């Protein structure tokens, strides 16, 4: 119970980042495709 | 054992994904911020 | 070519940890990931440059630098994830060739 609590608590976090790094990076698409194009 | 097992798994997909969008999207900003600035 | 941290406590009972590059005049960036099981996978600048591995016994990590050709010249920091928080140390520094 404590170990799948605490691996659920790693997806939670990991997910998130995963959620910011991507964001970030859509808008770095964003920017730079208007940059070059 | 079945859910750690599972959600363990989901942890390596995490990992890999969240890798291969950071290696591109680190190649992004090499390659574009370059091109800009 | 080698490069190590120390946690507080609780190796393998802590989850996932990975390690960062702060290449200068730029923002963060991931390195390498290992798991609670030894699972690990590199980042495509570095695949098959850097190889990472993990020691229970004595709550530690393991990078090692390899072949490496100056560009990846950085400061490096070591990275953790434990029960949803980060944790970050002060970190190191690369240099040239």
């Known amino acids: 119970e404590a170990k799948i609590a605490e691996l659920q608590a790693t997806i939670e976090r990991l997910t998130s980042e995963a959620a910011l790094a991507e964001g970030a990076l859509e808008a770095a698409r964003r920017d730079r495709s208007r940059l070059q194009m | 054992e079945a859910k750690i097992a599972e959600l363990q798994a989901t942890i390596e997909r995490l990992t890999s994904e969240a890798a291969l969008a950071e290696g591109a999207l680190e190649a992004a900003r090499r390659d574009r911020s370059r091109l800009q600035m | 070519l080698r490069l190590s941290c120390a946690s507080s406590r609780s190796i393998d009972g802590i989850n996932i940890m990975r390690w960062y590059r702060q290449a200068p005049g730029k923002q963060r960036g991931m390195v390498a990931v290992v798991t609670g099981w030894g699972s690990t996978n590199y980042v495509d600048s570095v695949k098959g440059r850097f190889i990472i591995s993990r020691d229970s016994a004595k709550d530690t990590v393991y990078l090692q630098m390899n072949n490496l050709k100056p560009e990846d010249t950085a400061v490096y920091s070591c990275?953790?994830?434990?029960?949803?928080?980060?944790?970050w140390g002060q970190g190191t520094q690369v240099t040239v060739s």
């Open positions: 990275n953790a994830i434990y029960r949803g928080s980060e944790y």
